[PDB]
């Protein structure tokens, strides 16, 4: 045959295609939150963010840049024996509400340490979230075998300090046959990874074009959400471990690299 593979599938395995629009609307572009990232560290669209979580984490402006067409967030060795994962996360000025959708094309660093996209407005107490990634492929915990090919995703729903969560995660093992990313650590080649946030209840996650897990909010979101990456560590065996210091000074292992993101909003046509 003189066909592609691709051709035999609706899915966009490279990303750069949304979902099938419902009848009656249609999707455009939301450019401030869209970036190839051709053109530097676009501060009208994005802001480094630095509020720490928990030890060993210290995040720092220096910690991400834009350089050779992608956005990056490295983690260096620091010398507070509290404060030593020095690390970075970049968050939109932007705020977005469904009908929309985002995706975003990642590599991750190779080191023991959540890689992730997510969208939240609120704090410990109230928020509404996505996380369409907190991805590890390098567990250091000894207790994550499926970790390099499972995409973590989850959202949560808080209110008063009453927590709805449920995960949908999904496994890039379990992708189609034709898919050229199917089985390949998160690592290895850049993935995409997308969520269809379809109204106040329905999200639908998409690894590599294909439908991924999905979750339903026990609550109506209500709340519209910035978009955000960043790369953390951990003394826990649910993040898949503490990352190996030693693995800090390897640049080939440590910087998590976004080569894209494209977000749109569905709208009537
Ligand atoms: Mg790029």
């Known amino acids: 045959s003189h066909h592609h593979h691709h051709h035999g599938s609706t899915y966009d395995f490279t990303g750069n295609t949304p979902p099938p629009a419902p009848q009656g609307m249609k999707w455009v572009k939301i450019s401030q939150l869209s970036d190839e990232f051709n053109n530097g560290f676009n501060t009208d669209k994005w802001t480094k963010s630095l509020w720490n979580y928990g030890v060993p984490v210290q995040m720092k402006?220096?910690?991400?840049?834009?350089?050779?067409?992608?956005?990056?967030?490295?983690?260096?060795?620091?010398?507070?024996?509290?404060?030593?994962?020095?690390?970075?996360?970049?968050?939109?000025?932007?705020?977005?509400?469904?009908?929309?959708?985002?995706?975003?094309?990642?590599?991750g660093a190779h080191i023991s340490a959540y890689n992730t996209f997510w969208l939240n407005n609120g704090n410990i107490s109230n928020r509404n979230e996505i996380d369409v990634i907190e991805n590890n492929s390098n567990p250091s915990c000894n207790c994550q075998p499926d970790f390099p090919w499972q995409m973590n995703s989850q959202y949560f729903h808080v209110v008063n300090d009453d927590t709805k969560?449920?995960?949908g995660n999904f496994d890039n093992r379990e992708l189609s046959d034709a898919n050229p990313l199917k089985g390949v650590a998160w690592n290895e080649e850049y993935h995409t990874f997308g969520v269809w946030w379809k109204d106040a209840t329905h999200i639908q996650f998409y690894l590599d074009g294909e439908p991924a897990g999905s979750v339903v909010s026990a609550r109506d979101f209500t709340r519209e959400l910035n978009?955000?990456?960043?790369?953390?560590?951990?003394?826990?065996?649910?993040?898949?471990?503490?990352?190996?210091?030693?693995?800090?000074?390897?640049?080939?292992?440590?910087?998590?690299?976004?080569?894209?993101?494209?977000?749109?909003?569905?709208?009537?046509?």
């Not at 994962?85 to 995706?103: D, G, H, I, L, W």
């Not at 503490?242 to 569905?266: C, F, G, P, R, V």
């Open 61 to 107: 402006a220096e910690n991400s840049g834009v350089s050779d067409g992608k956005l990056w967030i490295k983690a260096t060795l620091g010398n507070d024996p509290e404060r030593w994962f020095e690390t970075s996360r970049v968050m939109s000025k932007a705020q977005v509400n469904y009908p929309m959708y985002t995706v975003s094309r990642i590599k």
């Open 227 to 269: 978009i955000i990456w960043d790369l953390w560590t951990v003394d826990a065996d649910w993040l898949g471990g503490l990352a190996k210091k030693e693995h800090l000074s390897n640049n080939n292992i440590n910087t998590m690299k976004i080569d894209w993101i494209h977000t749109y909003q569905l709208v009537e046509e």
């Open 165 to 167: 969560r449920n995960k």
